Amino acid sequence: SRLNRESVIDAALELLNETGIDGLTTRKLAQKLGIEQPTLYWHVKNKRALLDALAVEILARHHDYSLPAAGESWQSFLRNNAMSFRRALLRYRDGAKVHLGTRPDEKQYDTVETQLRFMTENGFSLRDGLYAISAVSHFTLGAVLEQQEHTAALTDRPAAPDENLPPLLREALQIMDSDDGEQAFLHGLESLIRGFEVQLTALLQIV
Amino acid sequence: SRLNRESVIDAALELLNETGIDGLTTRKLAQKLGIEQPTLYWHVKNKRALLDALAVEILARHHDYSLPAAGESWQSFLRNNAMSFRRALLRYRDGAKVHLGTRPDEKQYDTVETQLRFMTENGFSLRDGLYAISAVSHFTLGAVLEQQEHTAAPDENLPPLLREALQIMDGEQAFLHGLESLIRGFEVQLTALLQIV
Ligand SMILES: C[NH+](C)c1cc(NC(=O)CNC(C)(C)C)c(O)c2c1C[C@H]1C[C@H]3[C@H]([NH+](C)C)C(O)=C(C(N)=O)C(=O)[C@@]3(O)C(O)=C1C2=O
Ligand SMILES: [Cl-]
Ligand SMILES: [Cl-]
Ligand SMILES: [Cl-]
Ligand SMILES: [Cl-]
Ligand SMILES: [Cl-]
Ligand SMILES: [Cl-]
Ligand SMILES: [Cl-]
Ligand SMILES: [Cl-]
Ligand SMILES: [Mg+2]
């Protein structure tokens, strides 16, 4: 089949949904594209290069709330940015593990620069704007990684000692399972953003 | 060598520091222990069983602030608990990737039950206590993974605000700042009760 950049990525994302990150191999990708491995090699050197391209392409295609809307509050921006980030990472199997394995490229540095300019124009110190951006990223990535690695584990581990659970824990585990963690995520997000606001709002006052 | 639980985990943690999570295999573990693969299999069925056990044992050995002190505020407990969790995850190479996706083990049940009892005895609903505990976990995991990996915000080419931000600064600062933000947000939510907030 065609081996333009776009088609190679389309097949690689299809393979990633089939195999997950550990099972994705250039051999399987060649077979899916109907080509020999040395043909694929001309197009993409190794699994590392493929995963780096997939991470960038997952965000470029599906993380579309990178930049604040005209006159958007910093609160609303961080919220929409986090939801778009989570949604992009959840779109492919082990998508967060794909994102984790890559260094930010020139385009990701430009995006953080725009975000940091925005935060500082909204009254954040440089340090505090970057800590807010990093905290939202760390929280969102951890939430998604815990959700996808729980699903990956479900292959080799059944569910564990039911009979044994103490009662708050048992009820808690039932609540988190009702919705695969969207509620936990959205609640935690509001907490994080409000915390940033209380800190910013103090200015130089002890808080 | 000895193949009790403790010695298999010691060897596996030594291997993990050598190879990282992707490179840790039952075959390389058998080699490290000086045994044949079918000998190891009797003790350890597969990599998932090994990783699950390492997640538990890393906290048992290195997570020292599982429980609130007598009379400690919930804020202080979440802060001390998160620092201790971060410290345990950083103790071994790819420690946060070893933790990812695990669930509380039966040997952690009493500990996690005490955490939830404590939050609810401090005024959190079960849901709100649980979301605080989950958000602290997920944030700490994110922060450590981005530190063990190198995943977030060439020197000539950095854009200028980012470059100045990096110049006026190993993850701990951003982590501790984010932790205080999360704790304050929990407190605003708890204090609001039924008020529009
Ligand atoms: C909130 N409780 C009910 C809970 C639930 C899950 N897992 C899930 O909800 C699984 N959710 C799916 C199945 C993806 C829908 C959880 O996965 C967890 C926890 C508890 C935490 C407690 C963490 C705690 N610290 C960091 C806040 C802690 O100190 C310990 C400890 N001393 O052993 C933990 O075990 C903890 O770090 C931890 O790992 C938890 C969970 O994994
Ligand atoms: Cl072609
Ligand atoms: Cl193309
Ligand atoms: Cl390869
Ligand atoms: Cl972003
Ligand atoms: Cl033995
Ligand atoms: Cl033992
Ligand atoms: Cl295995
Ligand atoms: Cl300079
Ligand atoms: Mg856990």
From residue A133, give the alpha-carbon distance in Å to each of A66, A100, B134: 12, 16, 20
- How many Cα atoms occupy the beta-carbon half-sphere of A79 within 13 Å? 14
Residue A46 marked as a ligand binder = no
Residue ranges around ligand 1 (CB below 6 Å): A 147, 150, 169, 172-173, 176-177, 180-181; B 59, 63, 66, 81, 85, 102-104, 108, 111-112, 130, 133-134, 136-137
The structure tokens listed for A37 are 């491995």
Q: Technique behind this structure?
A: X-ray
Final resolution, Å: 2.0
**DSSP for chain B?**
---SHHHHHHHHHHHHHHHHHHH--HHHHHHHHT--HHHHHHH---HHHHHHHHHHHHHHHH----S--TT--HHHHHHHHHHHHHHHHHTSTTHHHHHTT----GGGHHHHHHHHHHHHHTT--HHHHHHHHHHHHHHHHHHHHHHHHT----GGGS-HHHHHHHHT---HHHHHHHHHHHHHHHHHHHHHTTS--
Rounded to an integer, what distance in angstroms lies between the CA atom of residue A39 and that of residue A30? 8
Q: Measure the CA–CA gap between A122 and A200, rounded to whole angstroms.
A: 9
In angstroms, rounded to a whole number, what is the distance separating the alpha carbons of residues A99 and A46?
17
B177 is in an annotated binding site: no
The domains of chain B, with CATH numbers, are 1-65 (1.10.10.60), 66-196 (1.10.357.10)
CB A131 within 8 A of CB B174: yes
- Residues with Cβ within 8 Å of residue A70, at least 6 apart in sequence: none
Integer Cα distance of B179 and B86 in angstroms: 11
Separation between Cα atoms, residue B54 and residue B86, nearest integer Å: 16
Contact (CB<8Å) A192/B139? yes
CA distance B11 to chain A (A): 22
The DSSP symbol for A16 reads: H
Which DSSP string do the residues of A174-206 spell out, in sequence order?
HHHHHTTTHHHHHHHHHHHHHHHHHHHHHTTS-
Which pair of structure tokens corresponds to residue A64? 């579309």
The set of long-range contacts for A40-43, using a CB threshold of 8 Å and a minimum separation of 24, is A40/A3, A40/A8, A43/A3, A43/A8
Asked if B9 contacts B49 with a C-beta cutoff of 8 angstroms, the reply is: no
